Write a protein that binds this ligand. Structure first.
Ligand SMILES: Nc1ncnc2c1ncn2[C@@H]1O[C@H](COP(=O)(O)OP(=O)(O)OP(=O)(O)O)[C@@H](O)[C@H]1O
Ligand SMILES: Nc1ncnc2c1ncn2[C@@H]1O[C@H](COP(=O)(O)OP(=O)(O)OP(=O)(O)O)[C@@H](O)[C@H]1O
Ligand SMILES: Cc1cn([C@H]2C[C@H](O)[C@@H](COP(=O)(O)OP(=O)(O)OP(=O)(O)O)O2)c(=O)[nH]c1=O
Ligand SMILES: [Mg+2]
Ligand SMILES: [Mg+2]
Ligand SMILES: [Mn+2]
Ligand SMILES: [Mn+2]
Ligand SMILES: [Mn+2]
Ligand SMILES: [Mn+2]
Lengths: 683, 289, 289, 683
């Protein structure tokens, strides 16, 4: 066993009844003085390194050609001047195993952390040396972390796409289904997770040109998509991951759910395609009143009204659907469907739950389209227009397929540096650059939506780490007050940066004029309610930083009205799974699953303590499963009120609790304004 | 918790030798080299001799000492399969491939063979040591039985499966596959009966029974390596056979509720080719907060 | 001269109770008087007990002491039939016709019934008295087994046959006929093995063995009379059943090579009415025409 | 049990030791007296019937509008003047259960046999009343039978395409694979059987964008295609049928074959995807000499030579591939592979066998392309060019995808009418019309090849029926003499009609000038070998008909040289599954499987004796399984020497014969010039 492995395992060997957390630090030293420094490839100077990486097809030469070598040297020197040290063994291990650039045979390390950060910063700046240094300082301080696709692939010749998630709308036609399968394979080839809205597809037993009971429903398309994602599995490196979203009022909703039952037959079971359910407020109202609900056949509704079932408001059209004899429907028990959802989530963690009305009551771009589904991580909530892929030799009507670039603020590092504004603006600029340089030649709706919406996702990580390292319980009202203030600041500065980009470029996102940003409605709660901290401890935490007031929000509203906004969507809180290790941060705004996690790598086992875990903050690092899910819902709703897109909200459940407890948590989330629920992980 | 389920699986797997016509094997048998024919004969005799011990002693002795009418019935069924089905099947394969004089000589050789005898007598010794109303001695015999069913047969099964996976000796390979499928379930079932005894013991007694099982496995394994080289070096297969022995040793341990002893290894692809949370209704007022 | 043909006959007679659907008897069962249902349940319970011990003890122990792999294979197969097929079939019948409490009560009734306990004590005692390499103790147990197969079952068999012959309970009756068909060949086979041992003796020893057989038969007979009266008086059939058991006692004696002991009588005529493809390698000559 | 079913089951009841065959005739009468006439919709006049069928969207207005009502009435009167009577119950039952037009509620019969024949004739003639009457006389004499798609769908508005055999070339790209899946779905939606060539696809473990061990091979593509064919199942009417062809020198050939093994796992086995193997002469030579063969990685060959492995002649390329270090290959035993093919055919009848050199040594259009694969029925053998389907908003390079037009001559009816020439020419004209009226808007290469090649398949059926009713054993040399003469006349008149159509329209098929028809090579064996019958009995059979001599063939060769040929391909012998029942004929040129076949429809049993079966010809109606497969191969080769495309050739084996016998039959078929082997049906 390696020396650093033994040093890391020495953490759990208690001394005087206490964990040896400091041993972890020793491990990193070993991991660098025995493996990383020996396995790294050193050159005489930076010129030889850059030339070797360029000619050997490791780096794209275009982004490096925008800078003179003196500027690149200055950027690299700025990166190395911080003398960044990984405080935990797992941070360095995760970076050098998942994100550091290696040779073709993967026998040596070509990229250090500073090298990777410098390359990403130079790609972000697009020829601006000062901007590149700003990005270097932002990432080496670990205030901002680009998503895994962006951080791993920026400036690389053998790179994939920098966009993490893609959302596709599938129209009710064989041509559209085949095009959706093709685009899903193309985007999984690019490495991104693909989500498909199957609510427009007509249910099982519908007519294909006057011959009835002909359609296979959404389950056949689900099987096709599952095989497509199995085939396109990132060249066999990462398993192809897809998501299917169906409205709960679709007739196939049961069969949909039956794809995830552990007793499902092979002709129905789907195993590589995640499932999500979109629940309008009408379904929750029907379940609450115990009135029997009706699921609908989408094609009959489309024939009668000319629009898809998910294209209009069910809260106002459900009674018209039920009373219409030309609309076909089936009777269901909404409470039984809710119990089935809870049982399925207990068994397998599926489906994702999207509260459609919670998303669309604060959605700023309802004029473009209502949000009808979410992404594979159930945090992207954007307007999408379905595409009409016609026959060959016929022009296709290209719609809008959602796609946003992810980037997370490290809350602990951002607040320690007292740089919410600067970090938010620089992250917005980096995400705007990632969107601008993204061009996908096989997904036309994705390309058009990227060019028009200009949507980005700016997330946050290390919420629980910051709260526990500052002596604040994650479930406490003080923690929710901090989240309210911090994310109001993040939203304020993201809107300010979006408006500044719109002013400097003279262009807004497409159809911005009909948005609530243009009409000023979006700023209502910000121009009437003060989001400054209500607790003295939180206010002290925010000292040295100008917390925006109602007057600052009014000025920002006027600025947006004058100049517009460059981005249709700005903030989305992704799960941030593996890149949180490198940043020494807790995953996303979720509470920690465990204080010390035991992970098996190779034939060895390693223990990763939570960042900053110690004796004095052991009980502030409360495990998520031990927490009240209602207070976690309260925290997520408090954050969500300042996030325009959704938050990947994983439910952390105990084995003792029943499906009724899961249903109660889901209904409280819906009541509190939670937009989406990601996972039901049971301990 | 398990005997009726195993009863069902056992009786639905019932088969007879006559169902597989053997004569068409002569069309591939004639094309094998002398070393291949020699190894096959020796392996076959090894399996035959070990399976006879299991039919005459192993299964009936366990059926005798186990309490429970339903368990005795399942065990009787397994003993029947050894004596009435498996033994006749091995004899049929032999009579098809070799003349009477060759069969007698192979059995004379394998009967005198040091590595076959060592393992055969080790297993039989543990069956003979069972004492009335002593569950410890019964457990030790069950461990021996599981090791035979789930481990010791497999150095032998390798070769017929190797041919079967190549399209050679398909009729006898089909028979061997049916036999092997019976021995697999026999091993799992006896394993569950052993775990029942093991779980009734103190922690110190458990540790002592674990040491017994691992020590026995080690003795048998070291002899299997020698047995393997003795038979398979002449056809160049010993390295791959050794991987197959360890893989099956791990299955035998898992049948006894123990951890695998050997690291995971991939198996020869030719041989491979041959081979709820509590539902609680919503009570209303759960929609109001 | 006979084992191979018995082997073939036994294996070709193989069956499982699940092959016979029993829900068809539901109505003719419902229609019987309480007395009739009581006698029927108890009769089958007495049969279940006999088969339990024949499968658990009798057949395996005789198999252990009889020499020859083929003889052992037949006896092992017969043992399996006793407890894995016959004894279990009765539970299939019980589970179809009767509620759990009535089933529980009848199994409690076998434990406390003095005639059923006496006959089990006597038969199993003789099985457990067999001494290794002692042919006389083995003969005595084989006589006991023939008396169980060919005589003792028949006080029980009478009633299902009596109904079958009237077109009542015909699915249960089909099961019973299959069981009876098996016991008839089991009694003949064990009888032939007993005769082998008897024929080795001096005339003086033979005379003692006949005394043993006749004394045992009379002792079992007297107990069976009391058992028969206890079960059948409430349905009015005791005298008829007694004639049937005497008839079958003579068949048991004949299976042992002895003269009939009871005089012939007319049996109820109702009861009499109750009775991949083959693979060859390619030659170089198959590529030319 | 209905009266006609009792009269049909009375056939098996033997009177005087003989089957009551004549009782079948009575059954037909009952089937018409009790059922057909009662459930047949009758109209006061044909005008009302046509108006009702057109208005209720049963027929098409376009093809009926080309004639005056007097001409349509005259065509219908010509059809009804024959007073055609079905000779067997199964003929009428199959027509009125499969082909007769029924109401939307499927309880009444709108079309009789004469009505359907008249409608198909009017569709064929395209406005010519005399041509329509000629077609009516052709089909009511039952001399020619349009295929099931053409016969069922001609003139019907609610219909699929008239072509049901489609051959697709799949290029080695994700875009091309997705396009192939889409086209397969679209063509299965149209009701056609789709065959895909997977030899150009790179094997498992190949590089994608210079990353190693990334390709899933052709098995993942087969899984995708199998899912696509399961999804597209004719609106839930028939099981989606597809075929995949792989060259035997493709490395995936074993895994390909492993998709049909019973022991294959769920992630390996494809259930609704037929498989065929293309066997070049090089593989047969390697197996014959027992030399170990090499299966090649297609992408390495493409990188080294710039052409696909299946696009070059393996006979001259195999040694260069083996000796090339940059071509990756795996060692195999060709005899073991042949034994595996025989074993798989014994178990399941798969794969289809295509002898590439047997096809291409007589292929007339090798300049366009060599025949690389066959159809789902393994009788279509045409040149195909792969298409380069690029990314979106990029022009695709459309190639040639085979789609031939099926139609079968009834040999008994054709020869008893002494009308080989007239029937062949009229069938060629009808096939040309159906090919010209086919327009598929979702298969670009299929449409392009239909427009360019103008390939049709004119088959024959009732060969064994005709031979048995004329006292000729199917295995006799006289039967082969008759087949030789009859199919040489069929080829002669098909070529003459193609040249006449080319002269009339002034156009040939695309790239005809490079064909062997243009160079006169095709006619070589016809201008030197006389194909007149060598037996007096066969000559008397051909009495009253002019048999083309060598001088006639020379004149035809000169005519083709002067005027060209309209069809790239003319003759292909399809299995003719259900149309053989309606025509009261034996299926294809295959020998009969059973003298009397027992079928179960609903809960009723029915008995179909072979047409013309009696006590006198009971011995001549020998069953196919009892026949010597070598003599069946000889007859099929005799026919194949006059057929430009292939013949659906099913092997009929007994359970006693082993895989050595199957391999011997396959090798004798290869030796005798058999192009394709369809199925290995074991009795
Ligand atoms: N935790 C760590 N994170 C990142 N790099 C590390 C870490 N530990 C060691 N290294 C690398 O290994 C080298 C070993 O030097 P070390 O940290 O022991 O101190 P040093 O030799 O006094 O110099 P310095 O600390 O100034 O780099 C470091 O210079 C650095 O490049
Ligand atoms: N074998 C058959 N094949 C086809 N149609 C038949 C057959 N038998 C009867 N029919 C149908 O039933 C009708 C009645 O025929 P039938 O044998 O009674 O005498 P017919 O002289 O042909 O009658 P019609 O006056 O109808 O022409 C036929 O006209 C035809 O429509
Ligand atoms: C072709 C086909 C379609 N479908 C379903 C899936 C599609 O969502 C739906 C629409 O198919 P379409 O491609 O729209 O079929 P269509 O346009 O010819 O019919 P229509 O005019 O009614 O739109 O039909 C199947 O389930 N199986 C099939 O094989
Ligand atoms: Mg449509
Ligand atoms: Mg490519
Ligand atoms: Mn055995
Ligand atoms: Mn066993
Ligand atoms: Mn019995
Ligand atoms: Mn018995």
């Amino acid at each position: 066993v390696p020396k650093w492995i033994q040093l890391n395992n020495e953490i759990m060997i208690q001394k005087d009844g206490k964990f040896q957390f400091d041993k972890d630090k020793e491990a990193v030293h070993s991991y660098f003085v025995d493996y990383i420094n020996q396995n790294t490839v050193f050159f005489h100077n930076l010129k030889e390194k850059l030339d070797y990486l360029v000619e050997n097809q490791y780096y794209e030469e275009e982004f490096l050609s925008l800078y003179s070598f003196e500027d690149i040297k200055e950027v690299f020197k700025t990166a190395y001047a911080k003398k960044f040290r990984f405080p935990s063994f797992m941070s360095a291990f995760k970076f050098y195993n998942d994100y550091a650039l290696k040779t073709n045979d993967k026998k040596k390390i070509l990229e250090r952390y500073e090298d990777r950060i410098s390359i990403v910063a130079l790609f972000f700046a697009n020829g601006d040396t000062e901007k590149a240094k700003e990005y270097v300082n932002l990432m080496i301080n670990q205030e901002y972390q680009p998503s895994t696709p962006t951080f791993l692939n920026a400036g690389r010749k053998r790179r994939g796409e920098l966009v993490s998630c893609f959302l596709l709308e599938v129209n009710d036609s064989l041509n559209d289904i085949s095009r959706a399968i093709d685009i899903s394979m193309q985007l999984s080839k690019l490495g991104g997770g693909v989500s498909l809205n199957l609510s427009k597809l007509r249910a099982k037993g519908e007519a294909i040109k006057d011959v009835e009971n002909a359609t296979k429903g959404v389950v056949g398309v689900m099987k096709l998509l599952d095989n497509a994602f199995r085939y396109a599995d990132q060249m066999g490196q990462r398993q192809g991951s897809g998501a299917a979203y169906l409205n709960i009022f679709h007739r196939d909703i049961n069969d949909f759910l039956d794809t995830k039952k552990i007793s499902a037959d092979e002709d129905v079971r789907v195993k590589t395609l995640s499932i999500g359910v979109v629940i309008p407020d009408k379904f929750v109202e029907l379940a609450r009143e115990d009135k029997a609900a009706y699921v609908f056949y989408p094609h009959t509704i489309y024939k009668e009204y000319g629009q898809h079932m998910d294209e209009m408001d069910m809260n106002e059209m459900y009674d018209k659907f039920v009373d219409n004899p030309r609309v076909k429907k089936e009777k269901i028990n909404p409470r039984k469907l809710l119990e089935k959802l809870a049982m399925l989530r207990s068994e397998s963690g599926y489906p994702y739950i999207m509260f459609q009305d919670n998303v669309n009551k604060v959605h700023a771009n309802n004029h473009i389209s209502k949000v009808k589904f979410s992404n594979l991580c159930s945090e992207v909530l954007q307007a999408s227009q379905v595409s009409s892929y016609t026959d060959y030799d016929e022009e296709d009507e290209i719609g809008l397929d959602i796609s946003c670039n992810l980037g997370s603020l490290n809350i602990l590092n951002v607040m320690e540096h007292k740089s919410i504004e600067k970090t938010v603006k620089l992250a917005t600029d980096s995400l705007t650059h990632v969107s601008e340089t993204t061009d996908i030649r096989n997904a036309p709706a994705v390309r058009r939506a990227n060019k028009a919406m200009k949507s980005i996702g700016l997330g946050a990580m290390n919420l629980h780490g910051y709260l526990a390292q500052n002596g604040i319980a994650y479930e406490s009202p003080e923690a929710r007050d901090f989240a309210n203030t911090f994310f109001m600041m993040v939203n304020f500065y993201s809107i300010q940066r979006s408006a500044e980009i719109a002013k400097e470029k003279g262009e807004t996102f497409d159809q911005y004029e009909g948005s609530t940003y243009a009409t000023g409605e979006y700023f209502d709660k910000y121009v009437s309610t003060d989001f400054s901290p209500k607790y003295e401890k939180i206010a002290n935490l925010f000292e040295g930083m100008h917390i925006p007031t109602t007057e600052d929000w009014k000025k920002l509203k006027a600025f947006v009205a004058e100049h517009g906004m460059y981005h249709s969507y700005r903030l989305c809180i992704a799960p941030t799974g593996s890149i949180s290790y490198v940043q020494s941060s807790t995953a996303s705004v979720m509470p920690i699953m465990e204080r010390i996690e035991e992970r098996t790598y190779g034939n060895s086992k390693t223990y990763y303590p939570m960042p900053g875990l110690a004796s004095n903050n052991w009980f502030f690092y409360k495990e998520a499963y031990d927490m009240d899910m209602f207070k976690v819902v309260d925290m997520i709703a408090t954050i969500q009120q300042h996030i325009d897109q959704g938050i990947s909200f994983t439910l952390f459940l105990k084995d003792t609790m029943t499906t009724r407890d899961l249903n109660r948590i889901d209904l409280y989330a819906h009541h509190r304004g939670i937009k989406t629920i990601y996972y039901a992980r049971t301990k | 918790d398990f005997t009726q389920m195993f009863y069902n699986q056992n009786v639905k797997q019932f088969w007879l030798p006559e169902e597989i016509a053997l004569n068409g094997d002569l069309l591939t048998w004639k094309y094998l080299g002398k070393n291949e024919q020699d190894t096959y004969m020796k392996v076959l005799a090894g399996l035959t001799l070990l399976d006879t011990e299991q039919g005459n002693t192993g299964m009936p002795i366990v059926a005798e000492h186990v309490d429970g009418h339903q368990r005795k019935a399942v065990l009787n069924f397994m003993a029947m399969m050894e004596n009435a089905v498996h033994a006749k099947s091995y004899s049929n394969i032999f009579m098809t491939l070799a003349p009477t004089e060759t069969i007698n000589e192979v059995f004379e050789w394998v009967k005198q063979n040091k590595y076959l005898q060592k393992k055969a007598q080790m297993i039989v010794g543990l069956y003979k040591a069972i004492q009335k109303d002593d569950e410890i001695s019964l457990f030790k015999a069950m461990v021996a039985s599981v090791y035979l069913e789930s481990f010791l047969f497999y150095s032998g099964f390798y070769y017929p499966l190797y041919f079967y996976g190549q399209g050679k000796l398909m009729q006898s390979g089909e028979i061997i596959n049916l036999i092997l499928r019976d021995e697999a379930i026999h091993g799992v079932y006896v394993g569950l009966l052993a775990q029942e005894i093991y779980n009734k013991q103190t922690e110190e007694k458990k540790a002592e029974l674990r040491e017994f099982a691992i020590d026995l496995l080690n003795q048998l394994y070291e002899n299997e390596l020698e047995y393997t080289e003795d038979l398979y070096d002449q056809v160049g297969l010993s390295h791959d056979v050794k991987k197959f022995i360890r893989y099956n040793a791990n299955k035998a341990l898992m049948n006894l509720g123990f951890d695998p002893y050997f690291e995971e290894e991939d198996i020869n692809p030719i041989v491979l080719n041959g081979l709820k949370a509590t539902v609680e209704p919503l009570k209303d007022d759960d929609f109001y907060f």
